[PDB]
Amino acid sequence: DQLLIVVSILEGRHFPKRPKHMLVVEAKFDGEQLATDPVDHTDQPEFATELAWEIDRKALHQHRLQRTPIKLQCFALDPVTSAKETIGYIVLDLRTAQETKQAPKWYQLLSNKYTKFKSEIQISIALETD
Numbered sequence: 001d002q003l004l005i006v007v008s009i010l011e012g013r014h015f016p017k018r019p020k021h022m023l024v025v026e027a028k029f030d031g032e033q034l035a036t037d038p039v040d041h042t043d044q045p046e047f048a049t050e051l052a053w054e055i056d057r058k059a060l061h062q063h064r065l066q067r068t069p070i071k072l073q074c075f076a077l078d079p080v081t082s083a084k085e086t087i088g089y090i091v092l093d094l095r096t097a098q099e100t101k102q103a104p105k106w107y108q109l110l111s112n113k114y115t116k117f118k119s120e121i122q123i124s125i126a127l128e129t130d
Contacts, residue, residue, distance in 0.1 A: 001130065003055050005029065005097055007070060008124040009036060009047040010104055015119045017043050022077040024084065025121070027051045029070045030063065038077050047121070052128075060094075060127075069093050074109055074121070088112040090121060097125045 009025055022038035023045045034051040055063070072090040077083070088109030104124040112119055 003057060003060060004128045004130075005053045005055055005060075005070070005094070006124075006126045006128050007051045007072075007092065008104070008126070009049050009051065009072075010122040010124070011047065012045040012119065012121045013043070013106075014117050015041065015043050015045055016114050016117055017041065018076060020078065020080070022079055023047075023087075024075045024077050025049075026073045026075065027070055028073075029053050030055075030059075030068065038079065041076060064094055064098070067093060067095075070125070072107075072121075072123075074119075076113075085113070087114060088119065090123070092123065092125050094125075097127050099126075102126050 018041040021041040023041050024038050026035045036047050036049040039045050070092040074087045075084040076087050088111050090107045104122050106120045106122050109119045
């Protein structure tokens with residue numbers, strides 16, 4: 001009876017190949033942080049993960065009104081030291097979560113640490129009941 005905000009993180013492209021590193025996307029919405037598994041830091045990383053927040057019907061509409069974003073942070077993870085370095089960010093908003101036809105979009109990393117690379121991550125956002 002109560003909803004989920006479902007953020008599907010599919011694939012990246014135009015990343016540098018970093019053989020000793022992994023990629024992790026963490027997402028924050030309304031003070032709850034979620035994360036993907038580490039995936040190989042290739043030029044075309046494959047996340048293939050759904051991040052989901054359960055939300056109240058009432059709480060959802062208050063979030064739509066004040067324009068509450070979902071912020072995705074991308075990290076390069078060193079699997080030896082567990083050290084994470086921020087590489088860039090993606091801002092999603094909840095109004096496109098309420099689109100009757102679902103279609104994945106390419107989102108450029110903002111404040112991209114890899115300055116010469118036009119790194120992009122393909123993401124869908126949707127609402128699901130129960």
